[PDB]
Every structure is written in C-alpha cells, then in structure tokens.
PDB file of C-alpha atoms and ligand atoms in Angstrom:
ATOM      1  CA  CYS A   1      23.399 -85.551  66.806  1.00  0.00           C
ATOM      2  CA  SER A   2      22.890 -86.236  63.192  1.00  0.00           C
ATOM      3  CA  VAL A   3      19.855 -85.839  61.278  1.00  0.00           C
ATOM      4  CA  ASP A   4      18.948 -87.085  57.987  1.00  0.00           C
ATOM      5  CA  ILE A   5      16.404 -84.914  56.464  1.00  0.00           C
ATOM      6  CA  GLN A   6      15.145 -85.024  52.920  1.00  0.00           C
ATOM      7  CA  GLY A   7      12.856 -83.057  50.796  1.00  0.00           C
ATOM      8  CA  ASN A   8      10.537 -84.331  47.967  1.00  0.00           C
ATOM      9  CA  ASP A   9       9.048 -82.762  44.782  1.00  0.00           C
ATOM     10  CA  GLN A  10       6.023 -81.643  46.865  1.00  0.00           C
ATOM     11  CA  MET A  11       7.924 -78.679  48.244  1.00  0.00           C
ATOM     12  CA  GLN A  12       8.015 -80.491  51.664  1.00  0.00           C
ATOM     13  CA  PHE A  13      10.548 -81.810  54.188  1.00  0.00           C
ATOM     14  CA  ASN A  14      10.389 -84.334  57.013  1.00  0.00           C
ATOM     15  CA  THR A  15      11.731 -83.364  60.344  1.00  0.00           C
ATOM     16  CA  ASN A  16       9.845 -80.110  60.509  1.00  0.00           C
ATOM     17  CA  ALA A  17      11.250 -79.806  64.190  1.00  0.00           C
ATOM     18  CA  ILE A  18      14.931 -80.630  65.243  1.00  0.00           C
ATOM     19  CA  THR A  19      16.552 -81.183  68.505  1.00  0.00           C
ATOM     20  CA  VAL A  20      20.253 -80.980  69.081  1.00  0.00           C
ATOM     21  CA  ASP A  21      21.813 -82.300  72.224  1.00  0.00           C
ATOM     22  CA  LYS A  22      24.229 -80.270  74.353  1.00  0.00           C
ATOM     23  CA  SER A  23      26.235 -83.507  75.112  1.00  0.00           C
ATOM     24  CA  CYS A  24      27.615 -83.237  71.533  1.00  0.00           C
ATOM     25  CA  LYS A  25      30.402 -80.605  70.372  1.00  0.00           C
ATOM     26  CA  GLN A  26      29.072 -80.242  66.641  1.00  0.00           C
ATOM     27  CA  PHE A  27      25.984 -81.141  64.553  1.00  0.00           C
ATOM     28  CA  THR A  28      25.552 -82.499  61.156  1.00  0.00           C
ATOM     29  CA  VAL A  29      22.701 -82.348  58.747  1.00  0.00           C
ATOM     30  CA  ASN A  30      22.501 -84.244  55.522  1.00  0.00           C
ATOM     31  CA  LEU A  31      20.171 -83.293  52.803  1.00  0.00           C
ATOM     32  CA  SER A  32      19.001 -85.684  50.181  1.00  0.00           C
ATOM     33  CA  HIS A  33      16.647 -85.470  47.179  1.00  0.00           C
ATOM     34  CA  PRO A  34      14.230 -87.928  45.806  1.00  0.00           C
ATOM     35  CA  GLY A  35      12.503 -87.468  42.432  1.00  0.00           C
ATOM     36  CA  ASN A  36      13.543 -86.273  39.050  1.00  0.00           C
ATOM     37  CA  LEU A  37      12.614 -82.586  39.377  1.00  0.00           C
ATOM     38  CA  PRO A  38      15.918 -80.764  38.973  1.00  0.00           C
ATOM     39  CA  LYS A  39      17.658 -78.010  41.010  1.00  0.00           C
ATOM     40  CA  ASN A  40      15.853 -75.311  38.926  1.00  0.00           C
ATOM     41  CA  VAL A  41      12.334 -76.794  39.425  1.00  0.00           C
ATOM     42  CA  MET A  42      12.586 -78.022  43.064  1.00  0.00           C
ATOM     43  CA  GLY A  43      15.996 -77.372  44.611  1.00  0.00           C
ATOM     44  CA  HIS A  44      16.309 -77.693  48.380  1.00  0.00           C
ATOM     45  CA  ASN A  45      18.469 -75.726  50.657  1.00  0.00           C
ATOM     46  CA  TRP A  46      18.642 -76.488  54.375  1.00  0.00           C
ATOM     47  CA  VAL A  47      19.421 -72.954  55.812  1.00  0.00           C
ATOM     48  CA  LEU A  48      19.277 -72.191  59.467  1.00  0.00           C
ATOM     49  CA  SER A  49      18.518 -68.833  61.252  1.00  0.00           C
ATOM     50  CA  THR A  50      16.318 -67.430  64.161  1.00  0.00           C
ATOM     51  CA  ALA A  51      12.499 -66.647  63.678  1.00  0.00           C
ATOM     52  CA  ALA A  52      13.377 -62.934  63.462  1.00  0.00           C
ATOM     53  CA  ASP A  53      15.946 -63.263  60.679  1.00  0.00           C
ATOM     54  CA  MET A  54      14.269 -65.674  58.175  1.00  0.00           C
ATOM     55  CA  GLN A  55      12.711 -62.691  56.323  1.00  0.00           C
ATOM     56  CA  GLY A  56      16.215 -61.711  55.507  1.00  0.00           C
ATOM     57  CA  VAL A  57      17.584 -64.917  54.355  1.00  0.00           C
ATOM     58  CA  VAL A  58      14.247 -65.826  52.421  1.00  0.00           C
ATOM     59  CA  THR A  59      13.936 -62.232  50.716  1.00  0.00           C
ATOM     60  CA  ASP A  60      17.631 -61.253  50.239  1.00  0.00           C
ATOM     61  CA  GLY A  61      18.144 -64.818  49.406  1.00  0.00           C
ATOM     62  CA  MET A  62      15.584 -64.717  46.569  1.00  0.00           C
ATOM     63  CA  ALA A  63      17.251 -61.514  45.375  1.00  0.00           C
ATOM     64  CA  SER A  64      20.656 -63.378  44.922  1.00  0.00           C
ATOM     65  CA  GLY A  65      19.084 -65.726  42.349  1.00  0.00           C
ATOM     66  CA  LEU A  66      20.232 -69.107  41.095  1.00  0.00           C
ATOM     67  CA  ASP A  67      24.043 -69.141  40.931  1.00  0.00           C
ATOM     68  CA  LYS A  68      24.358 -67.117  44.211  1.00  0.00           C
ATOM     69  CA  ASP A  69      22.557 -70.350  45.653  1.00  0.00           C
ATOM     70  CA  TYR A  70      19.183 -68.495  46.263  1.00  0.00           C
ATOM     71  CA  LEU A  71      20.971 -67.465  49.618  1.00  0.00           C
ATOM     72  CA  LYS A  72      23.083 -64.280  49.265  1.00  0.00           C
ATOM     73  CA  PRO A  73      26.788 -63.827  50.231  1.00  0.00           C
ATOM     74  CA  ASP A  74      28.126 -63.779  53.901  1.00  0.00           C
ATOM     75  CA  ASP A  75      24.722 -63.530  55.564  1.00  0.00           C
ATOM     76  CA  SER A  76      25.361 -63.181  59.286  1.00  0.00           C
ATOM     77  CA  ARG A  77      21.863 -64.382  59.962  1.00  0.00           C
ATOM     78  CA  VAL A  78      22.730 -67.941  58.792  1.00  0.00           C
ATOM     79  CA  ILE A  79      24.712 -70.251  60.887  1.00  0.00           C
ATOM     80  CA  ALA A  80      24.281 -73.114  58.440  1.00  0.00           C
ATOM     81  CA  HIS A  81      23.480 -73.622  54.817  1.00  0.00           C
ATOM     82  CA  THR A  82      24.026 -76.745  52.781  1.00  0.00           C
ATOM     83  CA  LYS A  83      23.783 -75.724  49.119  1.00  0.00           C
ATOM     84  CA  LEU A  84      21.168 -76.006  46.538  1.00  0.00           C
ATOM     85  CA  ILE A  85      21.031 -79.625  45.657  1.00  0.00           C
ATOM     86  CA  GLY A  86      18.491 -81.229  43.390  1.00  0.00           C
ATOM     87  CA  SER A  87      17.243 -84.682  42.400  1.00  0.00           C
ATOM     88  CA  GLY A  88      19.780 -87.400  43.080  1.00  0.00           C
ATOM     89  CA  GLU A  89      22.110 -85.257  45.122  1.00  0.00           C
ATOM     90  CA  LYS A  90      22.970 -85.317  48.718  1.00  0.00           C
ATOM     91  CA  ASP A  91      25.022 -82.808  50.672  1.00  0.00           C
ATOM     92  CA  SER A  92      26.008 -81.998  54.213  1.00  0.00           C
ATOM     93  CA  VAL A  93      26.536 -79.323  56.831  1.00  0.00           C
ATOM     94  CA  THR A  94      28.792 -79.942  59.922  1.00  0.00           C
ATOM     95  CA  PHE A  95      28.410 -76.927  62.166  1.00  0.00           C
ATOM     96  CA  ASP A  96      29.457 -76.008  65.644  1.00  0.00           C
ATOM     97  CA  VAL A  97      26.834 -75.979  68.440  1.00  0.00           C
ATOM     98  CA  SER A  98      28.702 -73.070  70.135  1.00  0.00           C
ATOM     99  CA  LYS A  99      27.018 -70.973  67.426  1.00  0.00           C
ATOM    100  CA  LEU A 100      23.614 -71.605  69.109  1.00  0.00           C
ATOM    101  CA  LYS A 101      22.628 -70.358  72.571  1.00  0.00           C
ATOM    102  CA  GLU A 102      19.809 -72.046  74.552  1.00  0.00           C
ATOM    103  CA  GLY A 103      16.554 -70.286  74.910  1.00  0.00           C
ATOM    104  CA  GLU A 104      16.661 -68.968  71.391  1.00  0.00           C
ATOM    105  CA  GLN A 105      14.456 -70.086  68.570  1.00  0.00           C
ATOM    106  CA  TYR A 106      15.878 -71.166  65.424  1.00  0.00           C
ATOM    107  CA  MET A 107      14.001 -72.066  62.286  1.00  0.00           C
ATOM    108  CA  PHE A 108      15.382 -73.912  59.327  1.00  0.00           C
ATOM    109  CA  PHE A 109      14.175 -73.611  55.690  1.00  0.00           C
ATOM    110  CA  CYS A 110      14.763 -73.762  51.878  1.00  0.00           C
ATOM    111  CA  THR A 111      15.456 -70.323  50.337  1.00  0.00           C
ATOM    112  CA  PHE A 112      14.294 -71.398  46.911  1.00  0.00           C
ATOM    113  CA  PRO A 113      11.479 -69.012  45.559  1.00  0.00           C
ATOM    114  CA  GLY A 114       8.443 -69.884  47.679  1.00  0.00           C
ATOM    115  CA  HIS A 115       9.229 -73.128  49.378  1.00  0.00           C
ATOM    116  CA  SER A 116      10.104 -71.282  52.672  1.00  0.00           C
ATOM    117  CA  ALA A 117       6.392 -71.663  53.652  1.00  0.00           C
ATOM    118  CA  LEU A 118       5.775 -75.486  53.644  1.00  0.00           C
ATOM    119  CA  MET A 119       9.543 -76.079  54.180  1.00  0.00           C
ATOM    120  CA  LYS A 120      10.190 -74.749  57.712  1.00  0.00           C
ATOM    121  CA  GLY A 121      11.004 -76.550  60.989  1.00  0.00           C
ATOM    122  CA  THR A 122      12.412 -75.608  64.293  1.00  0.00           C
ATOM    123  CA  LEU A 123      15.793 -76.166  65.927  1.00  0.00           C
ATOM    124  CA  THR A 124      15.694 -76.038  69.793  1.00  0.00           C
ATOM    125  CA  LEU A 125      18.769 -77.046  72.003  1.00  0.00           C
ATOM    126  CA  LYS A 126      19.347 -79.298  75.155  1.00  0.00           C
TER     127      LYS A 126
HETATM  128 CU1   CU B 201      13.173 -76.281  48.419  1.00  0.00          CU
END
C-alpha cells in the first residue's frame, strides 16, 4: 502493497513512480491533503491509466467539470480513481492487480484542470 501518497497546495505529489508487487492479490492507494486550499482551488484525484489513454481521462475529464469529479462517467481507460478530495480529506482506492498486465506502462495523475502536468507518476508491476 500500500502506498500512501499525498498532494500539497503546490500542485505536486510525492511518489511520482509506484511499484506494485505480484506477490499481492490487490492494491490500495490512500490520498491525503495538507493545506487549507479547498477542493475547488486545489483538489487532488489519484486516477490511473496507461500513457496512451491519459489524454482521454485528462481532456474528457476536464469536460465533465466539478460535480462529475473532473473525471467523466464509466471511463474504460481508468482502472482506478479515488475522488476529488480537498484540504483535510483523505480517501482510498482498493483495486485488483488482475486489472494490470506486466510490460505495460501505467501513469497516474490528478484530472483537475491543469495539475496533470506536475502531478504524474508511473505504475510498473513485479
Ligand atoms: Cu490535483
């Protein structure tokens, strides 16, 4: 596995490169959030996808807007999204690891309006 990742008010993250073990049936991510800069001024998503899909889930996800969770509905290009948290929250995602092959490249990110540039990392498997 579990990671404990957290973003600031800088538009950053920490763990801009994850590694999930194969000797582990599921994976869980926990997002937290640090200063008082609300979920309309700095919210952070932790969405996962492959570095060939991101443009979908960033773009289509900024289309959706706030309420939709800056990440559209269904998106079968996401294997894991937490939700848009903000200052003082925490949330979590407990996904399968079936859902990921090995020898694929997966990037993670925050679909809020422009933080998918400084907030990206990688998820390789194992
Ligand atoms: Cu963000």
